[PDB]
From a paper:
[name] proteins are small GTPases, cycling between the GTP-bound form (active) and the GDP-bound form (inactive). [name] proteins are the central node in signaling pathways controlling cell proliferation, survival, and differentiation through interactions with various effectors, such as [name], PI3K, and others. [name], one of the three [name] isoforms ([name], HRAS, NRAS), is the most frequently mutated [name] protein in cancer patients, and G12, G13, and Q61 are three hot spots among the oncogenic mutations. For example, the [name] [name] mutant (KRASG13D), which has a reduced oncogenic phenotype compared to G12D, was found to favor State 1 conformation (with the switch I region open).
High-resolution crystal structures of active KRASG13D and KRASG13D-[name] [name] complex provide snapshots of the State 1 and 2 conformations, respectively. To gain detailed insights into the State 1 and 2 conformations of active KRASG13D, including the Switch regions, we solved high-resolution crystal structures of [name]-bound KRASG13D and KRASG13D in complex with [name] [name] at 1.2 Å and 2.0 Å, respectively. The electron density associated with [name], magnesium, and switch regions was unambiguous in the high-resolution maps. Since wild-type and mutant [name] in complex with effectors adopts the conformational State 2 in all crystal structures determined to date, presumably by both conformational selection and induced fit, the structure of an intermediate state could likely shed light into these interactions, with potential relevance for drug design. A structural comparison of [name]-bound KRASWT in the State 2 conformation with KRASG13D in the GDP-bound conformation and [name]-bound State 1 and 2 conformations shows four different snapshots of the Switch I region. Sidechain atoms of T35 and Y32 transition in opposite directions in these snapshots, illustrating how the conformation ensembles of the Switch I region change from inactive to active (State 1) and then from State 1 to State 2 conformations. The conformation of the T35 side chain is maintained in the State 2 conformation of WT and [name] mutant of [name]; however, the Y32 side chain occupies a different rotameric conformation due to a steric clash with D13 in the KRASG13D structure. The difference in Switch II is likely due to different crystal packing interactions and is not believed to be associated with the [name] mutation, different states of Switch I, or the presence of [name]-[name]. In the background of the [name] mutation, the binding between [name] mutants and [name]-[name] is enthalpically driven under our experimental conditions, unlike that of KRASWT. In the most stable double mutant KRASG13D,A130I, we found that the slight population shift (~10%) induced by a second mutation A130I resulted in a two-fold increase in the binding affinity to [name]-[name] compared with the single mutant KRASG13D.
Numbering used by the authors:
A (entry chain B): 56 to 103, 108 to 131
B (entry chain A): 1 to 167
Amino acid sequence: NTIRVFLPNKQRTVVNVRNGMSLHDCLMKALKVRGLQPECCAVFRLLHKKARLDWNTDAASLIGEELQVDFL
Amino acid sequence: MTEYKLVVVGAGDVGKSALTIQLIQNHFVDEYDPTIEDSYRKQVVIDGETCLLDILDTAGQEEYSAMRDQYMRTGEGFLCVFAINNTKSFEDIHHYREQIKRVKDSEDVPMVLVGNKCDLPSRTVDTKQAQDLARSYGIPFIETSAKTRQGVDDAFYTLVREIRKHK
Ligand SMILES: Nc1nc2c(ncn2[C@@H]2O[C@H](COP(=O)(O)OP(=O)(O)NP(=O)(O)O)[C@@H](O)[C@H]2O)c(=O)[nH]1
Ligand SMILES: [Mg+2]
């Protein structure tokens, strides 16, 4: 149960989704470690025209998706 | 700005991601959190040159060795990491080195052998085994601890220096 996330500055991560975490909570560590914070970024679901997402979207609802996080 | 593609490889649980996060953020992740794939970029000064490190932290769990081999092939230099309390991860170094040589289709690739978790008690992989193994490949061996940060910059900077002399 993971989500592939493309990150600013040509970085990327795959995160494990534990039960009951929002996207904010789910990506906090991967962003913190790279000197970013969710506050000044937007997150998008990439389709199969990307869809902008609220950071409070539940991470378990995006299992198997690909996301982009980008500076605002 | 000069860019160096570094790849951190080794068996699961040896400390590949903890070492990388110490280089990037000077912070020690005491968590268990296995990697699928993580890439990092950080700007550093080495031997008086500003350069960009692009660090691919691979999955030790070889069930994800598809994503691993896909991004290795662009790497210019490899950290081959084992943990001093895991003999299997030490014997596995041979496997990861032959994988690097296969994915690079070359005998000549910059590499550094890293023995991590040197802070732990009851070490089982002794210093002379490790130095002997590094010697057998003609590569530097660096003892590290991501917990205390010992050896962390030395491991990555040595790699960059090995990449520069390979031109
Ligand atoms: N005492 C000590 N613990 C360490 C050290 N390095 C890593 N650890 C711990 O060992 C465990 C595994 O570390 P981690 O970096 O996740 O390993 P990995 O090689 O990235 N694993 P994977 O390949 O699955 O992603 C974690 O609990 C981590 O905190 C170290 O130098 N000393
Ligand atoms: Mg890891």
